[PDB]
Design a protein around this ligand. Structure first.
Ligand code: PMP
Ligand code: PMP
Lengths: 453, 453
């Protein structure tokens, strides 16, 4: 990847010691938290920050975070996209506070459901919606409905996808091109040959071959892959994807959990995609676990034919989906505030300006230092990969990832006041991001790469 | 069931007309919401309230709810247990408001994680915890870890369980005693013969026969079944369950999502159970979708051997579980407030007194009217069933449920200012419930049954 991995190790060791010296109170907190949390924090992923422990946060507002050692950071991680519009958005926090004081979960709708439903239909151009407690659940429940309406069992996913803890998606290609369980993800009693057909992104011949078996209920995909570095769709790919799925009467599910960074109506709204189902995760509810999914008129009619509107005195049933806190008053209050006051044309304009500045700065550094790396941007989200050209598919992109280089870069920036999500080589801008924050990121990255070369 | 179903239908029809006359603004809201929500509300379950639409709530506090038609209710539904300690608990609402203003989701811990981890271990007597966004997910993830640590693929569940949208659990016995997909729940590409062994509750011989196959990773169960009416464990059942699972080296997972009504340490704490894993849902976080799960040190050691603590520079991985907003600052703030200020010995003392009064009143009515029905209480939760004696298992209990009778009773009470969850014949008391509220419930139920007989 253009770096001497021995030099990377040397710097990494120095930065691990620097981390220890700078963050003693977080380290002390980690010692205590390891006594009661299985992986030393409430979520096991939090153990994967670089350095010897995750930081304990004291407070965060906008794109600023302060830890319990008093260190201040510019935050380009933004809760690993869960806080994509910034921390403590005043309208959203106020809406949450107000609604908590007048009922957070009633198993009933409130007036906010009226406004939000209409807004979803307007913004995203699909007529009918439902709410879940996570993007994973939206994907799981949509897949269930697709199996119900189609009578087919398999889902098509793309190599190196991520769609949440959707067991049927947890596959990859081995060296012989065989579909096997994803590395480090136990098959969990699933026999994926019975549930899943795997294809590389940007491969219409392979997609046609998968669908031709006639056992595929749905294709599930991001419109632009974001969970193995960034893989843009090729020229003509979306047209072909949409045509092939129509020809085979297969549902097309577009997951915009990350690609909502492309604009106020997502990638689908910018590019005239025609999803059968549309999934969007928790950036919309201010840190309250949430997601929405929507469907076309044609899919709604098919769903109602297999699951009719409930009749008075009918036996109660969940039908295998929904959840007890799904669609609750608190979620809907936060969504209303977010769509009305946060996800505006002006917000996206600001985010794009700063993200374009950040992208251009990274690109200048890579070009100056002659690194065989590249940088890609989708709206507010910028990510680099350790290969010369944009990957044609997820398989290619996976080979350009390296845990040591990533950890070293991330830690070097963390120790100097910039937080990047540990799971990607990405930076996310929000309405509270400032030009000086981009300048700091740019300088530190140039400094780090400079020390390595 | 002791009632003429024809008289039940006649009253139900009258009460549906009464509902229309009393709730015109909710009906208008439903017409609008049907334009944009697939099932006319954010969650399809909300369509299953009795009456011709779900009520739209204006505000709720304690055990009081006011709808948009200005109708006031005593709430014994409490968000179908999601708000089991009452609506708008001041400490919890304040904690949510405070934390929203200083970062809701950071992919990092805060000082509240220290306090909550220690509190969970103290309260529930298991040392190691994790947080999810739902009880469903806690169950799914525990099952995954059990398959990983055991190398076995099957889970034992009990007939007429409910553990959330856990696909492997969605089975029942047919008339021939065959394990088949649960009625109305599509198998969803799961071949349950490969994932699941089904047994009736309170049947140690059948449980032994299931476990003897040597392919069971875990037994998943409520300690007292609450999702098919109430099924108490028989004398000696828990001792036998614990002994058999130990002998076969099978994980025992106790799901207290509802049975937390038994006391501040759940049924397990009251009755000295010894779970390997313990699951508790969203009642603990004030309407923020949440759950916790805990495990013994012995299970933790087996898990760490198959999923080691993360090493510096290791390739990032979700490992098939966790979630982006799981274990977030907002959840942990709400949990801290709930455990410190709400789920106290004094709160439960009040809840028990009022629930005992409610139980005694229901029992008196059933005995006076000579109905072949009975009532059961577990702590704050009271439920009746349309059979003479307590059911020995879920199979028996299922036969004593009737959608029409349930809808009629629920609607009669709703039209006279008492909300009961539409999915059960249950009432839940909280710290804000008053004796006069219980008296109103008691009178209306007696009035309704009186009109029917
Ligand atoms: C594209 C995509 N879809 C779905 C999910 C699942 O989201 P969650 O972890 O909130 O369920 C993620 C994770 N952010 C994602 O990146
Ligand atoms: C015993 C039990 N376990 C798990 C769940 C799942 O909870 P959720 O719908 O919040 O995932 C439920 C639903 N109340 C339940 O009753």
């Amino acid at each position: 990847f253009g770096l001497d991995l021995a030099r990377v190790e040397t710097l990494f060791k120095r930065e691990l010691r620097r981390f220890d010296e700078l963050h003693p109170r977080s380290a002390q907190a980690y010692r205590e938290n390891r006594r009661h949390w299985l992986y030393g924090a409430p979520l096991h992923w939090m153990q994967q920050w670089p350095g010897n422990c995750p930081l304990l946060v004291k407070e965060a507002q906008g794109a600023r975070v302060t830890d319990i050692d008093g260190q201040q950071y510019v935050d380009f991680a933004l809760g690993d996209s869960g806080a994509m519009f910034g921390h403590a958005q005043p309208a959203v926090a106020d809406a949450i506070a107000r609604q908590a004081r007048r009922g957070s979960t009633l198993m009933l709708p409130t007036e906010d459901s009226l406004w939000v439903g209409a807004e979803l239909a307007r913004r995203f151009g699909l007529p009918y919606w439902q709410v879940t407690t996570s993007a994973t659940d939206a994907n799981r429940f949509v897949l269930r409905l697709c199996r119900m309406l189609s009578g087919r069992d398999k889902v098509v996913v793309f190599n190196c996808n991520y769609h949440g803890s959707v067991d049927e998606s947890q596959v990859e290609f081995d060296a012989a091109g065989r579909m096997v369980p994803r590395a480090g993800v136990h098959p969990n009693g699933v026999r994926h040959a019975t549930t899943t057909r795997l294809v590389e992104f940007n491969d219409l011949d392979a997609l046609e071959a998968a669908l031709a078996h006639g056992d595929v209920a749905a294709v599930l995909t991001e419109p632009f892959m974001t969970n193995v570095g960034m893989v843009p769709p090729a020229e003509g790919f979306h047209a072909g994807l949409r045509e092939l799925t129509r020809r085979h009467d297969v549902a097309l599910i577009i997951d915009e959990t990350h690609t909502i960074s492309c604009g106020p109506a997502g990638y689908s709204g910018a590019h005239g995609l025609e999803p059968d189902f549309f999934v969007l995760g928790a950036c919309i509810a201010g840190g309250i676990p949430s997601a929405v999914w929507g469907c076309s008129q044609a899919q709604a009619e098919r769903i109602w034919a297999v699951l009719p509107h409930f009749r008075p005195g009918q036996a109660i049933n969940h039908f295998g989906f929904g959840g007890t806190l799904a669609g609750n008053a608190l979620q809907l209050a936060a969504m209303r505030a977010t769509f009305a006051e946060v996800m505006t044309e002006d917000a996206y304009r600001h985010m794009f300006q700063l993200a374009a500045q950040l992208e251009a700065g990274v690109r200048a550094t890579l070009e100056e230092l002659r690194l065989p790396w590249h940088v890609t941007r989708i709206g507010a989200r910028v990510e680099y990969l350790f290969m010369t050209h944009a990957p044609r598919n997820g398989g290619e992109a996976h080979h350009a990832r390296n845990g040591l280089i990533e950890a070293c870069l991330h830690l070097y920036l963390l120790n100097r006041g910039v937080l990047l999500t540990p799971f990607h080589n990405m930076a996310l801008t929000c309405p509270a991001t400032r030009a000086e924050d981009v300048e700091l990121h740019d300088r530190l990255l140039r400094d780090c790469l400079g020390e390595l070369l």
